[PDB]
């Protein structure tokens, strides 16, 4: 299985999402992240493997 990421439409950072989060809104922002660690646009983008 691969890692899904979504891009914040405000800050353009990519955020990892839980597997099987298969339905998203049209626009998505860091503030909507289920993970509170990455729920602010100021938090750096996680690296790729």
């Amino acid at each position: 299985s691969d890692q899904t990421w979504v891009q914040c439409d405000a800050c353009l950072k990519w955020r990892k999402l839980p597997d099987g989060m298969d339905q998203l809104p049209e626009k998505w922002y860091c503030s909507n992240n289920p993970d509170p660690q990455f729920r602010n646009c100021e938090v750096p983008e996680e690296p790729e493997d």
Partner: peptide, 11 residues
């Protein structure tokens, strides 16, 4: 939303 998929070695 804009999404992408990346390799994840652990899985």
């Amino acid at each position: 939303a804009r999404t992408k998929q990346t390799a994840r070695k652990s899985t």
